[PDB]
Amino acid sequence: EVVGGGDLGPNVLVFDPSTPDIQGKVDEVFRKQESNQFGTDRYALMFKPGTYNDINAQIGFYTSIAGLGLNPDDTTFNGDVTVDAGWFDGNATQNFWRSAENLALNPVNGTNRWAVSQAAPFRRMHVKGGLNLAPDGYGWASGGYIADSKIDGEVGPYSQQQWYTRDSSVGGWGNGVWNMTFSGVEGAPAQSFPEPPYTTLETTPVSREKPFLYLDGDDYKVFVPAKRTNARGTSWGNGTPEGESLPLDQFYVVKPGATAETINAAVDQGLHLLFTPGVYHVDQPIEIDRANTVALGLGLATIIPDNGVTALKVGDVDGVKVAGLLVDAGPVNSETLVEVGSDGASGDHAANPTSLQDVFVRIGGAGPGKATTSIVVNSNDTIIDHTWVWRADHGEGVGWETNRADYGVHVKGDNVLATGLFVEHFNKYDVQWSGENGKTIFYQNAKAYDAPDQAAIQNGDIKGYAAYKVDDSVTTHEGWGMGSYCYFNVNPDIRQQHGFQAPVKPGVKFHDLLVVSLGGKGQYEHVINDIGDPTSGDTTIPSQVVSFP
């Protein structure tokens, strides 16, 4: 019944080197999207292989930009892919929900500026120059994520609080502020936490590059990279990348108007899913219960579950690849927003795991939204490679009860790996880990700002809920480069007992932990459990623990 392939729709703007007035067209999109933080418009900018001149592609909200070559250098800009913070007067901490992928950049002054905060991935890029991650003026910034990229020159974070880079090559790295973490990065600074705060791993235990749309001659296909174990450096640096190409006609091209019934029928009939840029309400969960199904979003394609349903349920199958989607809570509380595997799921998926990549979750902000637990990861061996799970702290429909969301991520599966984990503002535990042999490389949290009083976050005999909790029953766990920040601005007398909570066991280990009070608005009593100094003063100095236990 469901037909594969077809037109990508009016929200995918496709350019070729002969297209007239590319700069004008990209500027038109930017003018509309620059300060459109919570609007429903969505755009994907796609560039056919070739060389583009005189281009400064400024990237606003809900805008993806990418090349369509098999390799990044197939699509080269003499010019820039720019994010700056002019619209927010130099403050980059709301520069969300945008992306760059699969381009080579020759920046006009020798340095490309990508001054982003959360949910702004930078993947499979070749920067023939330096990369500045800070807004002009060096104002506030809270990114960030680079994967599978080569920066010929220096990456300069400047004011960036923290950053995660994996499986990349850099010519240099300028500085660290609170938490700069690296895994598999050629050219990374050596391990040196706490000063500078560099957490450096020689390899990434497992990684699998995100699938992406490209052109094979004149035919659209999706490239599906093969997994790497103990990954280091780029996947494409040595020519022909390992992987499979799926023709576009094997994808159901989802466009505004599609129902979950039709989307589900497509997967049952053997089609993959390509979500064109838009906002999709569903009255029942999208169910992906076929092995190796790709569900790929363009232009920050967004799913809103109506009637309190779960937005996305992946079955107990190998190799599902969910990529580039925003799940946006409806005002009716959803018990869960995303489920990976069934409750009690018991099989292994080690050779061909399921992954979530550039999957973002929002609760509130564009109107009231509620969910009890945002992502539940049941399936063993699942890879979570860049997520931002965010209870809104600002916008419309925000409040301690108005956009209540108790739990961010709950990992129940075994051998689950999170690389680039960003989870913020939940009323209770932002992350809870119940499964065995979990690993997290890079964590960024901020606690809820709007707790009205101490009683509101009382957790048995503990003040507050950890940002990252490993259940007492767990035997093996390991985390690297992890920070939790507080800003109790509604009630700055509040105390948060710790950022992290875990059993004290030989196989449960942490490296380079920190907690930070932002401007003395509340304080931490400890870093992890009852260990580590409290934060003090109003000067935003981190409290650190190098090794636990």
Ligand X SMILES: OC[C@H]1O[C@@H](O[C@@H]2[C@@H](O)[C@H](O[C@@H]3[C@@H](O)[C@H](O)O[C@H](CO)[C@H]3O)O[C@H](CO)[C@H]2O)[C@H](O)[C@@H](O)[C@@H]1O
Answer whether 164's CB lies under 8 Å from 116's CB: no
Q: What is the dihedral of CA 313, 316, 320, 321, to 10 degrees?
A: 50
Q: Measured from the CB atom, is 10 or 394 closer to ligand X?
A: 394
Closest distance of CB 419 from ligand X, Å: 19
DSSP class per residue in 48-59: -SEEEEEEEEE-
Residue 183 half-sphere exposure toward CB, CA atoms < 13 A: 23
Q: Which stretch binds ligand X (CB under 6 A): 39-47, 60-68, 83-91, 524-532?
A: 83-91
Closest distance of CB 347 from ligand X, Å: 36
* Residue 353 to residue 154: CA distance in whole angstroms: 34
Q: Which stretch binds ligand X (CB under 6 A): 135-143, 295-303, 377-385, 505-513?
A: 135-143
Q: Which stretch binds ligand X (CB under 6 A): 65-73, 81-89, 202-210, 295-303?
A: 81-89
Q: Measured from the CB atom, is 31 or 230 closer to ligand X?
A: 31
509 forms beta bridges with: 478
| Residue 379 CB neighbour total at 10 angstroms | 29
* Residue 108 to residue 116: CA distance in whole angstroms: 19
3-state secondary structure 453-496: CHHHHEECCEECCCCEEECCCCCCEEEEEEEEEECCCCCCCCEE
Q: What is the contact mask toward ligand X in residues 430 to 469, using x (rule: CB under 6 A)?
A: ----------------x-----------------------
Q: Measured from the CB atom, is 41 or 84 closer to ligand X?
A: 84
* Residue 266 to residue 304: CA distance in whole angstroms: 19
Q: What is the contact mask toward ligand X in residues 235 to 264, using x (rule: CB under 6 A)?
A: ------------------------------
Report the residue from 23, 56, 284, 352 that binds ligand X according to the rule CB under 6 A: 56
Contact between 95 and ligand X per CB under 6 A: no
Q: What is the dihedral of CA 37, 41, 42, 48, to 10 degrees?
A: -120
Contact between 191 and ligand X per CB under 6 A: no
Contact between 109 and ligand X per CB under 6 A: yes
Answer whether 485's CB lies under 8 Å from 516's CB: yes
Give the number of residues in contact with ligand X, rule: CB under 6 A.
Answer: 24
* Residue 162 to residue 176: CA distance in whole angstroms: 7
Q: Which stretch binds ligand X (CB under 6 A): 14-22, 86-94, 179-187, 222-230?
A: 86-94
Closest by CA to 442, choosing from 468, 465, 464, is: 468
Q: Measured from the CB atom, is 407 or 487 closer to ligand X?
A: 487
Contact between 161 and ligand X per CB under 6 A: yes
Residue 468 tokens, joined: 């990252």
Report the residue from 75, 142, 387, 440 that binds ligand X according to the rule CB under 6 A: 142
Q: Measured from the CB atom, is 383 or 515 closer to ligand X?
A: 515
| Residue 306 CB neighbour total at 10 angstroms | 15
Q: What is the contact mask toward ligand X in residues 286 to 305, using x (rule: CB under 6 A)?
A: --------------------
Contact between 538 and ligand X per CB under 6 A: no
Contact between 158 and ligand X per CB under 6 A: no
Contact between 90 and ligand X per CB under 6 A: yes
Contact between 113 and ligand X per CB under 6 A: yes
Pairing mode, if any, of strands 98-101 and 63-67? Answer: parallel
Backbone angles phi, psi at 95, to 5 degrees: -85, 80
Q: Which residues bind ligand X (CB under 6 A)?
A: 56, 80, 82, 84, 86-87, 90, 93-94, 108-109, 113, 136, 140, 142, 161, 393-394, 424, 446, 487, 518-519, 540
